[PDB]
C-alpha cells in the first residue's frame, strides 16, 4: 500500500503541474488583456496534454561539445528532487513522517540547486555558463537568508515537525505572529524557485533561454516540470508554515481543502507577481538580500530568540 | 572470568498485563495514584541494586497490583473506561486533549464507585 501511496502522491502532482502551466498562461493573458489558451480544448483544458505529447514526441539532441553523462543526469536530478520534496508535507498526514522535516527540505533544495549548474556546465555554451553562474550567486543569497528565516519561524514552533506546525497554528496564524519574516520568506522563496523578478538563471531577454538553451524535447519538459513542481511545493510549504488550517482528526478532508485553497492562492500570487513586475539584475538581487534582508533577518532572529523567554511562552519540545 | 548467573525460565513467569498502550494511557493517572507503593518499591530496588535479577519479586508485585487495579475498574466502570480508551486509541499521538468528555465520564464513574 506504500507504493500505492507513492503513486497517489506523484501522479496528481504532475497533473497539477501541467494544469498550473495552463493556469499561468490564462492568468497572464487576462492580466495582459488577452484570453490565453481557449482553443485546444474546452476553455483550453487539453493544452497541457498537447504540449506534453509534442515535447515527448519531438527529437532530443545532445550538443557536439556537451558532456553527455552530466547532460542527461541533470533533468533526472531536477525532477527526482522536485517529486521528493513533497513526501514530508502533512496534508494533514505526511507520506513520510520525519522528526526533522524542515532540515530535510533545506538539504534537498540545496541539492536541487546542482541540476541547473550541471546542465549549464554540461551544455558547453557561453549562455549556459552565464546562467549557471547566475544560479550560483542567487543560491548563495537566498540560501543564507532562507536558513535564518526558517530558523526563527520554527523557533516560534518548538521543533522541525510540520505536524507540530499544524498544532502550533491550531488557534492563530504565523502570518499574524511574524508577518515581516513572512514577507522576507516569500521573497526568498521566489528567489529559490527562480521566479520573476528573480528569473535570472533562465532570463530570456538577456540570455537565449539561459541554462537550458541546449535542452530540447523531453529533457526540457523535465526541467519545466521540476520548476513548476518546486513552485507548488514551496507555496504549499509557505501555506503550512504561515497559514495554519484547522484540523479535525475524524474528518481530515477539511484540512486538505483548506490547504489546497491556500496553496492555490499563493501560486496564483506567484503568477500575479510575474505578470506585474520587471526583472532584477543578479548583482542587485545579491545586494537586496545581503544588504537589506540579512540585517533585518538577524535582528528578527534575535527578537524571536528573546520573545518566548521574556514572555514565558516557550513551545513544548515534543 | 566466571559464569553469568541467570534466573530460570520457570521463575520468570508471571501473569501478564495484556492491555494495549491505549488502555494503559487511558487509566494512567488513576493507576499511578492507586499502585504507587509497589511501583515505587520496584523502582527504588532497580535503581539501588542496578541488577534486573535482584528485583524480580518486586516486578511480580507490580504486575499483581496492576491486575488488581484493572479488575477493580472492570467490576465497576467497564463501559465508561471502554469509551474513554476507545476515544484515546483513535488519535495517532494518543492525545488526552481530544477525549475530555469520555475522560469526564470515566472520572465520575471511578470517583463514585471507587
Amino acid at each position: 500500500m506504500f507504493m500505492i501511496n507513492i503513486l497517489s502522491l506523484i501522479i496528481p502532482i504532475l497533473l497539477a503541474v501541467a494544469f498550473l502551466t495552463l493556469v499561468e498562461r490564462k492568468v497572464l493573458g487576462y492580466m495582459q488583456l488577452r484570453k490565453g489558451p481557449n482553443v485546444v480544448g474546452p476553455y483550453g483544458l487539453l493544452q497541457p496534454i498537447a504540449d506534453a505529447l509534442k515535447l515527448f514526441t519531438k527529437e532530443p539532441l545532445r550538443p557536439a561539445t556537451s558532456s553527455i553523462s552530466m547532460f542527461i543526469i541533470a533533468p533526472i536530478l531536477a525532477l527526482s528532487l522536485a517529486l521528493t520534496m513533497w513526501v514530508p508535507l502533512p496534508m494533514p498526514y505526511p507520506l513520510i513522517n520525519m522528526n526533522l522535516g524542515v532540515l530535510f527540505m533545506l538539504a534537498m533544495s540545496s541539492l536541487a540547486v546542482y541540476s541547473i549548474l550541471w546542465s549549464g556546465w554540461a551544455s558547453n555554451s557561453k549562455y549556459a555558463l552565464i546562467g549557471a553562474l547566475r544560479a550560483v550567486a542567487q543560491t548563495i543569497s537566498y540560501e543564507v537568508t532562507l536558513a535564518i528565516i526558517l530558523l526563527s519561524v520554527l523557533l516560534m514552533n518548538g521543533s522541525y515537525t510540520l505536524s507540530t506546525l499544524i498544532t502550533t497554528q491550531e488557534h492563530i496564524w504565523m502570518i499574524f505572529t511574524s508577518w515581516p519574516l513572512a514577507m522576507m520568506w516569500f521573497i526568498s522563496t521566489l528567489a529559490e524557485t527562480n521566479r520573476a523578478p528573480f528569473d535570472l538563471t533562465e532570463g530570456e531577454s538577456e540570455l537565449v533561454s539561459g541554462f537550458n538553451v541546449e535542452y530540447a524535447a523531453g529533457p526540457f519538459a523535465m526541467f519545466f516540470m521540476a520548476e513548476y513542481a518546486n513552485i507548488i511545493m514551496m507555496n504549499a510549504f509557505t501555506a503550512i508554515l504561515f497559514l495554519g488550517a484547522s484540523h479535525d482528526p475524524h474528518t481530515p478532508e477539511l484540512y486538505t481543502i483548506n490547504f489546497v485553497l491556500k496553496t492555490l492562492a499563493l501560486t496564483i500570487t506567484f503568477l500575479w507577481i510575474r505578470a506585474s513586475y520587471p526583472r532584477f539584475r543578479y548583482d542587485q538581487l545579491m545586494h537586496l538580500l545581503w544588504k537589506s534582508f540579512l540585517p533585518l533577518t538577524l535582528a528578527l532572529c534575535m527578537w524571536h530568540i528573546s520573545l518566548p523567554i521574556m514572555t514565558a511562552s516557550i513551545p513544548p519540545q515534543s | 572470568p566466571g559464569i553469568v548467573e541467570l534466573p530460570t525460565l520457570e521463575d520468570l513467569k508471571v501473569q501478564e498485563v495484556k492491555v494495549s498502550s491505549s488502555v494503559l494511557k487511558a487509566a494512567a493517572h488513576h493507576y499511578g495514584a492507586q499502585c504507587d507503593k509497589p511501583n515505587k518499591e520496584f523502582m527504588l530496588c532497580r535503581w539501588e541494586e542496578k541488577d534486573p535479577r535482584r528485583c524480580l519479586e518486586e516486578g511480580k508485585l507490580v504486575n499483581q497490583c496492576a491486575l488488581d487495579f484493572f479488575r477493580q475498574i472492570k467490576r465497576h466502570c467497564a463501559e465508561p473506561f471502554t469509551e474513554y480508551w476507545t476515544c484515546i486509541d483513535y488519535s495517532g499521538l494518543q492525545l488526552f486533549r481530544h477525549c475530555r468528555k469520555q475522560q469526564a465520564k470515566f472520572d465520575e464513574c471511578v470517583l463514585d464507585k471507587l
Partner: protein
C-alpha cells in the same frame, strides 16, 4: 526503508522519462544541428575558458555564514534548558558576532563586486 523506496521510485520515473524522450521520437542528427548555439554565428572561443567571478569574496563569506547558520540551527532545542539566561546570552553573542562580521565586510567594501 520507506524513504529509500520513495527515492528509488522518483529516480526510476525520471530515468524512464529520459529513456522515453531519447528513444520514442524519430532521430536525425548532423554536424550543423548539434553545433553549439551562439545566436546564429560560430563561437569565437570556447566555453571552457576561465569565466571571471566578480563576487568571489561573497562566496567565501557565504561559506562562513553557512557555518553560522549551522551553529544557529539547534536553537529550538536549546531553549528547553534550565540555563535560559546562559543560553540566551550565548545565542545573542553568536548573532551579534555574525552581525559584526557583516558590518565589517560592508564597511570594508567586501560586498561590492569587482570591476
Amino acid at each position: 526503508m520507506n524513504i529509500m523506496l520513495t527515492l528509488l521510485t522518483n529516480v526510476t520515473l525520471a530515468s524512464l522519462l529520459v529513456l522515453i524522450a531519447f528513444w520514442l521520437p524519430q532521430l536525425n542528427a548532423y554536424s550543423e544541428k548539434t553545433s553549439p548555439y551562439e545566436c546564429g554565428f560560430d563561437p569565437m572561443g570556447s566555453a571552457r575558458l576561465p569565466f571571471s567571478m566578480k563576487f568571489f569574496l561573497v562566496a567565501i563569506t557565504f561559506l562562513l555564514f553557512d557555518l553560522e547558520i549551522a551553529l544557529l540551527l539547534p536553537l529550538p532545542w536549546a531553549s528547553q534548558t534550565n540555563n535560559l539566561k546562559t543560553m540566551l546570552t550565548m545565542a545573542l553573542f553568536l548573532l551579534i558576532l555574525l552581525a559584526a562580521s557583516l558590518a565589517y565586510e560592508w564597511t570594508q567594501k567586501g560586498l561590492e563586486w569587482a570591476e
